[PDB]
mmCIF file of C-alpha atoms in Angstrom:
data_model
loop_
_atom_site.group_PDB
_atom_site.id
_atom_site.type_symbol
_atom_site.label_atom_id
_atom_site.label_comp_id
_atom_site.label_asym_id
_atom_site.label_seq_id
_atom_site.Cartn_x
_atom_site.Cartn_y
_atom_site.Cartn_z
ATOM 1 C CA UNK S 1 -8.304 25.670 -38.183
ATOM 2 C CA UNK S 2 -6.911 23.827 -35.160
ATOM 3 C CA UNK S 3 -3.427 22.920 -33.950
ATOM 4 C CA UNK S 4 -2.162 20.226 -31.596
ATOM 5 C CA UNK S 5 0.065 21.122 -28.665
ATOM 6 C CA UNK S 6 1.677 19.458 -25.665
ATOM 7 C CA UNK S 7 0.676 21.451 -22.580
ATOM 8 C CA UNK S 8 2.452 19.693 -19.687
ATOM 9 C CA UNK S 9 6.095 19.969 -20.721
ATOM 10 C CA UNK S 10 8.009 18.781 -17.659
ATOM 11 C CA UNK S 11 11.726 18.171 -18.185
ATOM 12 C CA UNK S 12 13.575 15.048 -17.035
ATOM 13 C CA UNK S 13 17.299 14.399 -16.618
ATOM 14 C CA UNK S 14 18.180 10.713 -16.287
ATOM 15 C CA UNK S 15 21.217 8.464 -16.543
ATOM 16 C CA UNK S 16 22.226 7.525 -20.087
ATOM 17 C CA UNK S 17 21.629 3.894 -19.087
ATOM 18 C CA UNK S 18 17.846 4.409 -19.154
ATOM 19 C CA UNK S 19 16.437 4.856 -22.660
ATOM 20 C CA UNK S 20 12.983 5.370 -24.176
ATOM 21 C CA UNK S 21 11.220 7.511 -21.569
ATOM 22 C CA UNK S 22 7.424 7.234 -21.778
ATOM 23 C CA UNK S 23 4.926 8.683 -19.269
ATOM 24 C CA UNK S 24 2.837 6.203 -17.289
ATOM 25 C CA UNK S 25 1.176 8.097 -14.453
ATOM 26 C CA UNK S 26 1.182 11.217 -12.321
ATOM 27 C CA UNK S 27 0.661 11.936 -8.652
ATOM 28 C CA UNK S 28 0.809 14.594 -5.985
ATOM 29 C CA UNK S 29 4.327 13.511 -4.979
ATOM 30 C CA UNK S 30 5.878 12.582 -8.320
ATOM 31 C CA UNK S 31 5.507 11.443 -11.900
ATOM 32 C CA UNK S 32 6.388 8.062 -13.414
ATOM 33 C CA UNK S 33 7.899 7.160 -16.781
ATOM 34 C CA UNK S 34 8.739 3.801 -18.274
ATOM 35 C CA UNK S 35 12.229 3.132 -19.616
ATOM 36 C CA UNK S 36 14.584 0.335 -20.651
ATOM 37 C CA UNK S 37 17.738 -0.453 -18.667
ATOM 38 C CA UNK S 38 20.371 -0.547 -21.406
ATOM 39 C CA UNK S 39 22.587 -2.915 -19.407
ATOM 40 C CA UNK S 40 20.223 -5.774 -18.545
ATOM 41 C CA UNK S 41 17.540 -4.873 -21.097
ATOM 42 C CA UNK S 42 14.857 -4.984 -18.401
ATOM 43 C CA UNK S 43 11.894 -2.618 -18.278
ATOM 44 C CA UNK S 44 12.045 -0.126 -15.388
ATOM 45 C CA UNK S 45 9.850 2.610 -13.932
ATOM 46 C CA UNK S 46 11.485 5.935 -13.052
ATOM 47 C CA UNK S 47 9.727 8.218 -10.574
ATOM 48 C CA UNK S 48 10.702 11.884 -10.505
ATOM 49 C CA UNK S 49 9.804 13.418 -7.149
ATOM 50 C CA UNK S 50 7.569 16.470 -7.541
ATOM 51 C CA UNK S 51 9.286 19.453 -5.866
ATOM 52 C CA UNK S 52 10.563 17.333 -2.941
ATOM 53 C CA UNK S 53 12.178 20.370 -1.262
ATOM 54 C CA UNK S 54 9.414 22.948 -1.702
ATOM 55 C CA UNK S 55 8.546 22.483 1.988
ATOM 56 C CA UNK S 56 9.837 20.693 5.060
ATOM 57 C CA UNK S 57 6.820 18.354 5.002
ATOM 58 C CA UNK S 58 7.428 17.304 1.393
ATOM 59 C CA UNK S 59 11.121 16.818 2.185
ATOM 60 C CA UNK S 60 10.330 14.678 5.220
ATOM 61 C CA UNK S 61 7.962 12.523 3.170
ATOM 62 C CA UNK S 62 10.454 12.115 0.315
ATOM 63 C CA UNK S 63 13.197 11.092 2.749
ATOM 64 C CA UNK S 64 10.930 8.569 4.478
ATOM 65 C CA UNK S 65 9.798 7.104 1.142
ATOM 66 C CA UNK S 66 13.425 6.737 0.051
ATOM 67 C CA UNK S 67 14.490 5.012 3.270
ATOM 68 C CA UNK S 68 11.463 2.699 3.287
ATOM 69 C CA UNK S 69 12.170 1.691 -0.312
ATOM 70 C CA UNK S 70 15.837 1.058 0.521
ATOM 71 C CA UNK S 71 14.972 -1.038 3.583
ATOM 72 C CA UNK S 72 12.581 -3.516 1.960
ATOM 73 C CA UNK S 73 14.122 -6.357 -0.070
ATOM 74 C CA UNK S 74 11.253 -8.696 -0.977
ATOM 75 C CA UNK S 75 9.851 -9.911 -4.290
ATOM 76 C CA UNK S 76 6.259 -8.880 -3.451
ATOM 77 C CA UNK S 77 7.263 -5.413 -2.207
ATOM 78 C CA UNK S 78 8.326 -2.647 -4.574
ATOM 79 C CA UNK S 79 12.027 -1.937 -4.170
ATOM 80 C CA UNK S 80 14.741 0.318 -5.522
ATOM 81 C CA UNK S 81 16.889 -0.698 -8.477
ATOM 82 C CA UNK S 82 18.681 2.671 -8.416
ATOM 83 C CA UNK S 83 18.449 6.211 -7.039
ATOM 84 C CA UNK S 84 20.106 9.183 -8.673
ATOM 85 C CA UNK S 85 20.224 12.954 -8.965
ATOM 86 C CA UNK S 86 21.350 14.939 -12.028
ATOM 87 C CA UNK S 87 22.631 17.731 -9.761
ATOM 88 C CA UNK S 88 26.400 17.975 -9.364
ATOM 89 C CA UNK S 89 26.714 19.253 -5.772
ATOM 90 C CA UNK S 90 24.630 19.750 -2.641
ATOM 91 C CA UNK S 91 24.090 23.465 -3.281
ATOM 92 C CA UNK S 92 22.392 22.591 -6.595
ATOM 93 C CA UNK S 93 20.475 19.576 -5.241
ATOM 94 C CA UNK S 94 16.786 19.979 -6.137
ATOM 95 C CA UNK S 95 15.580 16.757 -7.832
ATOM 96 C CA UNK S 96 16.165 13.044 -7.410
ATOM 97 C CA UNK S 97 14.776 9.984 -9.162
ATOM 98 C CA UNK S 98 13.796 6.507 -7.978
ATOM 99 C CA UNK S 99 14.144 3.436 -10.217
ATOM 100 C CA UNK S 100 11.875 0.445 -9.651
ATOM 101 C CA UNK S 101 10.891 -2.664 -11.615
ATOM 102 C CA UNK S 102 8.219 -1.919 -14.208
ATOM 103 C CA UNK S 103 4.753 -3.335 -13.526
ATOM 104 C CA UNK S 104 2.333 -3.152 -16.447
ATOM 105 C CA UNK S 105 -0.722 -2.277 -14.365
ATOM 106 C CA UNK S 106 -2.339 -2.275 -10.933
ATOM 107 C CA UNK S 107 -5.008 -4.577 -9.536
ATOM 108 C CA UNK S 108 -7.659 -1.844 -9.678
ATOM 109 C CA UNK S 109 -7.646 -1.528 -13.465
ATOM 110 C CA UNK S 110 -7.133 -5.284 -13.776
ATOM 111 C CA UNK S 111 -10.380 -5.998 -11.908
ATOM 112 C CA UNK S 112 -12.213 -4.129 -14.683
ATOM 113 C CA UNK S 113 -10.108 -5.379 -17.610
ATOM 114 C CA UNK S 114 -9.391 -9.071 -16.929
ATOM 115 C CA UNK S 115 -11.136 -12.264 -15.900
ATOM 116 C CA UNK S 116 -9.846 -13.361 -12.490
ATOM 117 C CA UNK S 117 -10.603 -17.023 -11.861
ATOM 118 C CA UNK S 118 -9.849 -19.050 -8.768
ATOM 119 C CA UNK S 119 -6.171 -19.724 -9.541
ATOM 120 C CA UNK S 120 -5.173 -16.151 -10.416
ATOM 121 C CA UNK S 121 -7.050 -14.813 -7.376
ATOM 122 C CA UNK S 122 -5.331 -17.393 -5.168
ATOM 123 C CA UNK S 123 -1.894 -16.458 -6.513
ATOM 124 C CA UNK S 124 -2.488 -12.696 -6.218
ATOM 125 C CA UNK S 125 -3.794 -12.859 -2.629
ATOM 126 C CA UNK S 126 -0.884 -15.211 -1.883
ATOM 127 C CA UNK S 127 1.608 -12.591 -3.059
ATOM 128 C CA UNK S 128 -0.231 -9.831 -1.179
ATOM 129 C CA UNK S 129 0.028 -11.785 2.056
ATOM 130 C CA UNK S 130 3.703 -12.648 1.561
ATOM 131 C CA UNK S 131 4.548 -8.993 0.945
ATOM 132 C CA UNK S 132 2.479 -7.967 3.963
ATOM 133 C CA UNK S 133 4.201 -10.555 6.159
ATOM 134 C CA UNK S 134 7.569 -9.156 5.105
ATOM 135 C CA UNK S 135 6.452 -5.559 5.762
ATOM 136 C CA UNK S 136 4.965 -6.421 9.162
ATOM 137 C CA UNK S 137 8.109 -8.336 10.136
ATOM 138 C CA UNK S 138 10.025 -5.076 9.598
ATOM 139 C CA UNK S 139 7.578 -3.347 11.957
ATOM 140 C CA UNK S 140 5.874 -1.318 9.211
ATOM 141 C CA UNK S 141 2.119 -1.023 8.672
ATOM 142 C CA UNK S 142 0.751 -0.135 5.249
ATOM 143 C CA UNK S 143 -2.490 1.304 6.716
ATOM 144 C CA UNK S 144 -3.930 2.262 3.301
ATOM 145 C CA UNK S 145 -3.927 -0.958 1.284
ATOM 146 C CA UNK S 146 -6.166 -0.802 -1.786
ATOM 147 C CA UNK S 147 -6.265 -2.308 -5.301
ATOM 148 C CA UNK S 148 -4.537 0.797 -6.657
ATOM 149 C CA UNK S 149 -1.503 0.112 -4.440
ATOM 150 C CA UNK S 150 -1.013 -3.437 -5.803
ATOM 151 C CA UNK S 151 1.036 -3.459 -9.005
ATOM 152 C CA UNK S 152 0.828 -6.504 -11.284
ATOM 153 C CA UNK S 153 2.996 -7.413 -14.269
ATOM 154 C CA UNK S 154 2.451 -9.829 -17.181
ATOM 155 C CA UNK S 155 3.495 -12.880 -15.135
ATOM 156 C CA UNK S 156 0.810 -12.259 -12.465
ATOM 157 C CA UNK S 157 3.631 -11.168 -10.150
ATOM 158 C CA UNK S 158 2.438 -8.647 -7.570
ATOM 159 C CA UNK S 159 4.219 -5.862 -5.695
ATOM 160 C CA UNK S 160 2.883 -3.632 -2.922
ATOM 161 C CA UNK S 161 3.284 0.131 -3.404
ATOM 162 C CA UNK S 162 3.059 3.223 -1.185
ATOM 163 C CA UNK S 163 3.609 1.487 2.156
ATOM 164 C CA UNK S 164 4.482 3.189 5.431
ATOM 165 C CA UNK S 165 3.707 6.645 3.998
ATOM 166 C CA UNK S 166 0.453 6.981 5.955
ATOM 167 C CA UNK S 167 -10.444 4.621 -3.318
ATOM 168 C CA UNK S 168 -9.929 5.828 0.245
ATOM 169 C CA UNK S 169 -12.027 3.940 2.671
ATOM 170 C CA UNK S 170 -13.761 0.992 1.079
ATOM 171 C CA UNK S 171 -10.726 -1.069 2.113
ATOM 172 C CA UNK S 172 -10.011 0.655 5.448
ATOM 173 C CA UNK S 173 -10.326 -1.306 8.666
ATOM 174 C CA UNK S 174 -13.058 -0.213 11.105
ATOM 175 C CA UNK S 175 -10.398 0.893 13.607
ATOM 176 C CA UNK S 176 -9.118 3.326 10.971
ATOM 177 C CA UNK S 177 -12.546 4.794 10.156
ATOM 178 C CA UNK S 178 -13.407 5.780 13.739
ATOM 179 C CA UNK S 179 -9.804 5.788 15.060
ATOM 180 C CA UNK S 180 -11.150 3.886 18.056
ATOM 181 C CA UNK S 181 -8.017 1.862 18.920
ATOM 182 C CA UNK S 182 -4.274 1.837 18.385
ATOM 183 C CA UNK S 183 -3.417 0.455 14.963
ATOM 184 C CA UNK S 184 -1.905 -3.023 14.682
ATOM 185 C CA UNK S 185 -0.615 -4.845 11.611
ATOM 186 C CA UNK S 186 -3.918 -6.676 11.128
ATOM 187 C CA UNK S 187 -5.517 -3.525 9.693
ATOM 188 C CA UNK S 188 -3.826 -4.508 6.433
ATOM 189 C CA UNK S 189 -5.399 -7.951 6.737
ATOM 190 C CA UNK S 190 -8.849 -6.350 6.707
ATOM 191 C CA UNK S 191 -7.968 -4.601 3.452
ATOM 192 C CA UNK S 192 -6.859 -7.878 1.877
ATOM 193 C CA UNK S 193 -10.175 -9.438 2.819
ATOM 194 C CA UNK S 194 -12.091 -6.639 1.144
ATOM 195 C CA UNK S 195 -9.887 -6.832 -1.944
ATOM 196 C CA UNK S 196 -10.203 -10.606 -2.049
ATOM 197 C CA UNK S 197 -13.985 -10.400 -1.781
ATOM 198 C CA UNK S 198 -14.101 -7.864 -4.600
ATOM 199 C CA UNK S 199 -11.873 -10.143 -6.661
ATOM 200 C CA UNK S 200 -14.339 -13.014 -6.244
ATOM 201 C CA UNK S 201 -17.732 -11.334 -6.627
ATOM 202 C CA UNK S 202 -16.653 -8.377 -8.769
ATOM 203 C CA UNK S 203 -18.486 -5.965 -6.441
ATOM 204 C CA UNK S 204 -17.141 -3.703 -3.706
ATOM 205 C CA UNK S 205 -17.952 -5.424 -0.412
ATOM 206 C CA UNK S 206 -18.275 -2.337 1.838
ATOM 207 C CA UNK S 207 -19.162 0.714 -0.298
ATOM 208 C CA UNK S 208 -20.309 3.591 1.917
ATOM 209 C CA UNK S 209 -20.961 7.269 1.229
ATOM 210 C CA UNK S 210 -19.839 8.808 4.549
ATOM 211 C CA UNK S 211 -17.647 7.279 7.271
ATOM 212 C CA UNK S 212 -20.551 6.232 9.488
ATOM 213 C CA UNK S 213 -22.193 4.749 6.396
ATOM 214 C CA UNK S 214 -19.003 2.723 5.884
ATOM 215 C CA UNK S 215 -19.371 1.318 9.384
ATOM 216 C CA UNK S 216 -23.079 0.666 8.766
ATOM 217 C CA UNK S 217 -22.255 -1.374 5.659
ATOM 218 C CA UNK S 218 -19.493 -3.221 7.535
ATOM 219 C CA UNK S 219 -21.652 -4.142 10.529
ATOM 220 C CA UNK S 220 -24.465 -5.277 8.245
ATOM 221 C CA UNK S 221 -22.104 -8.168 7.446
ATOM 222 C CA UNK S 222 -20.030 -8.589 10.615
ATOM 223 C CA UNK S 223 -22.802 -7.767 13.085
ATOM 224 C CA UNK S 224 -22.460 -5.685 16.217
ATOM 225 C CA UNK S 225 -19.396 -6.511 18.347
ATOM 226 C CA UNK S 226 -19.731 -7.671 21.959
ATOM 227 C CA UNK S 227 -20.008 -4.984 24.623
ATOM 228 C CA UNK S 228 -16.653 -5.999 26.121
ATOM 229 C CA UNK S 229 -14.948 -4.902 22.895
ATOM 230 C CA UNK S 230 -16.768 -1.575 23.124
ATOM 231 C CA UNK S 231 -15.458 -1.073 26.663
ATOM 232 C CA UNK S 232 -11.849 -1.638 25.557
ATOM 233 C CA UNK S 233 -12.017 1.198 23.021
ATOM 234 C CA UNK S 234 -9.822 4.235 23.643
ATOM 235 C CA UNK S 235 -11.976 6.888 21.964
ATOM 236 C CA UNK S 236 -14.901 8.108 24.062
ATOM 237 C CA UNK S 237 -16.949 9.222 21.050
ATOM 238 C CA UNK S 238 -16.596 5.799 19.434
ATOM 239 C CA UNK S 239 -17.503 4.079 22.715
ATOM 240 C CA UNK S 240 -20.680 6.143 23.087
ATOM 241 C CA UNK S 241 -21.506 5.577 19.400
ATOM 242 C CA UNK S 242 -21.124 1.795 19.573
ATOM 243 C CA UNK S 243 -23.141 1.711 22.808
ATOM 244 C CA UNK S 244 -26.275 3.087 21.146
ATOM 245 C CA UNK S 245 -26.190 0.830 18.098
ATOM 246 C CA UNK S 246 -29.054 -1.683 17.780
ATOM 247 C CA UNK S 247 -28.053 -5.341 17.964
ATOM 248 C CA UNK S 248 -27.158 -6.897 14.602
ATOM 249 C CA UNK S 249 -26.444 -10.555 13.888
ATOM 250 C CA UNK S 250 -23.494 -11.768 11.832
ATOM 251 C CA UNK S 251 -24.473 -12.576 8.251
ATOM 252 C CA UNK S 252 -23.251 -15.819 6.695
ATOM 253 C CA UNK S 253 -20.393 -15.125 4.289
ATOM 254 C CA UNK S 254 -21.496 -17.963 1.987
ATOM 255 C CA UNK S 255 -24.756 -16.081 1.438
ATOM 256 C CA UNK S 256 -22.767 -12.896 0.778
ATOM 257 C CA UNK S 257 -20.104 -14.496 -1.426
ATOM 258 C CA UNK S 258 -22.342 -16.808 -3.439
ATOM 259 C CA UNK S 259 -19.629 -17.684 -5.983
ATOM 260 C CA UNK S 260 -16.787 -18.409 -3.541
ATOM 261 C CA UNK S 261 -15.273 -21.771 -2.678
ATOM 262 C CA UNK S 262 -15.724 -22.972 0.924
ATOM 263 C CA UNK S 263 -12.031 -22.382 1.657
ATOM 264 C CA UNK S 264 -12.256 -18.807 0.376
ATOM 265 C CA UNK S 265 -15.309 -18.191 2.570
ATOM 266 C CA UNK S 266 -13.484 -19.668 5.571
ATOM 267 C CA UNK S 267 -10.388 -17.505 5.071
ATOM 268 C CA UNK S 268 -12.502 -14.371 4.551
ATOM 269 C CA UNK S 269 -14.476 -15.155 7.711
ATOM 270 C CA UNK S 270 -11.176 -15.242 9.580
ATOM 271 C CA UNK S 271 -10.007 -11.997 7.926
ATOM 272 C CA UNK S 272 -13.094 -9.761 8.215
ATOM 273 C CA UNK S 273 -13.797 -9.629 11.962
ATOM 274 C CA UNK S 274 -14.283 -6.323 13.781
ATOM 275 C CA UNK S 275 -11.886 -7.124 16.628
ATOM 276 C CA UNK S 276 -8.385 -6.706 15.202
ATOM 277 C CA UNK S 277 -6.913 -9.044 17.829
ATOM 278 C CA UNK S 278 -9.106 -11.870 16.500
ATOM 279 C CA UNK S 279 -7.952 -11.324 12.905
ATOM 280 C CA UNK S 280 -5.433 -13.753 11.477
ATOM 281 C CA UNK S 281 -1.999 -12.343 10.815
ATOM 282 C CA UNK S 282 -0.425 -12.481 7.370
ATOM 283 C CA UNK S 283 1.439 -15.646 8.352
ATOM 284 C CA UNK S 284 -1.664 -17.306 9.794
ATOM 285 C CA UNK S 285 -3.653 -16.418 6.668
ATOM 286 C CA UNK S 286 -0.854 -17.860 4.513
ATOM 287 C CA UNK S 287 -1.130 -21.130 6.469
ATOM 288 C CA UNK S 288 -4.840 -21.433 5.636
ATOM 289 C CA UNK S 289 -5.803 -24.483 3.518
ATOM 290 C CA UNK S 290 -6.895 -22.042 0.791
ATOM 291 C CA UNK S 291 -3.174 -21.621 0.007
ATOM 292 C CA UNK S 292 -2.289 -25.311 0.394
ATOM 293 C CA UNK S 293 -1.760 -25.773 -3.352
ATOM 294 C CA UNK S 294 0.946 -23.085 -3.503
ATOM 295 C CA UNK S 295 4.614 -23.474 -2.589
ATOM 296 C CA UNK S 296 5.167 -22.960 1.152
ATOM 297 C CA UNK S 297 5.127 -19.590 2.924
ATOM 298 C CA UNK S 298 9.680 -15.984 8.813
ATOM 299 C CA UNK S 299 11.507 -13.238 6.861
ATOM 300 C CA UNK S 300 14.812 -12.220 8.435
ATOM 301 C CA UNK S 301 14.540 -8.445 8.058
ATOM 302 C CA UNK S 302 15.895 -5.779 10.382
ATOM 303 C CA UNK S 303 13.324 -3.778 12.306
ATOM 304 C CA UNK S 304 12.842 -0.423 10.604
ATOM 305 C CA UNK S 305 14.115 2.388 12.846
ATOM 306 C CA UNK S 306 11.916 5.430 12.168
ATOM 307 C CA UNK S 307 13.737 7.687 14.658
ATOM 308 C CA UNK S 308 15.926 9.054 11.856
ATOM 309 C CA UNK S 309 12.745 10.104 10.051
ATOM 310 C CA UNK S 310 11.387 12.001 13.069
ATOM 311 C CA UNK S 311 14.471 14.172 13.686
ATOM 312 C CA UNK S 312 13.433 17.823 13.466
ATOM 313 C CA UNK S 313 15.380 19.323 10.560
ATOM 314 C CA UNK S 314 15.499 22.553 8.621
ATOM 315 C CA UNK S 315 15.021 22.321 4.864
ATOM 316 C CA UNK S 316 18.777 22.626 4.289
ATOM 317 C CA UNK S 317 19.339 19.720 6.680
ATOM 318 C CA UNK S 318 16.612 17.675 4.978
ATOM 319 C CA UNK S 319 18.321 18.348 1.646
ATOM 320 C CA UNK S 320 21.705 17.290 3.039
ATOM 321 C CA UNK S 321 20.447 14.043 4.589
ATOM 322 C CA UNK S 322 18.480 13.179 1.439
ATOM 323 C CA UNK S 323 21.549 13.991 -0.676
ATOM 324 C CA UNK S 324 23.623 11.607 1.439
ATOM 325 C CA UNK S 325 20.941 8.932 0.989
ATOM 326 C CA UNK S 326 20.926 9.458 -2.794
ATOM 327 C CA UNK S 327 24.721 9.380 -3.130
ATOM 328 C CA UNK S 328 25.039 6.347 -0.835
ATOM 329 C CA UNK S 329 23.441 4.193 -3.552
#
């Protein structure tokens, strides 16, 4: 009395090298399939961009994603193995595909599926910080680091995803919630801290309903910042808001993270401070004694020039520049 049917029937056109296409995930900007590279035999992930040239905004974002992926060459940062288009000429150019190493899962699902002891947590945070140090050395800020953006394979190797293209705010720095200061690289550090805390205790550290509730939950732990920090804020609304907050003392992280080693508590105390200038950088965090047991952790990477991304272009010009990028691979 019933019949089965596939309802989403999207069509892919990929190089003959990649065999065994299998869906993995979807997204607003593209869909991902697993495949096997016939040459090396390695497992790869192929992302088909979702209508990249339906609008000038989508085209700009696809071009920036492509250039960011081409620029980064680090083991803890997702990179490009290949880029291709099935279209034969520029006038027919409508779809292009990105090829990346295949990661079995992301840290978000892993936190609910797997036991994460001290050693695996240490290694994962270690890889996060190395990838972040590489990204920051290139002058790029992730700005939206979360467990879903951290891919992990079977070897506990980690890669950062969706960087520079800026669930939503439990891992956002306080300067991102209120937009009260110019963003620095250390915003990503805050995210790591949150993630690391959630890795240790198994509970979201700062889980708020609305934005102001997020800041309430944050300052319950960090305490109110000194008035001097409030006077250096750029936003006037945030300044007036922080003025009228009742005084709150800093809570001891050992009481918060009851099942954390002293070194973990120390590193987290240096990561989760309200003033971004007082936060350790990725390199300083990597030098913490918490990572002493791991092999030593500057990257020589060219500064990323975003001027080419900000050139005002028509859709035809976006298609031509993206086509050149695709063919230049």
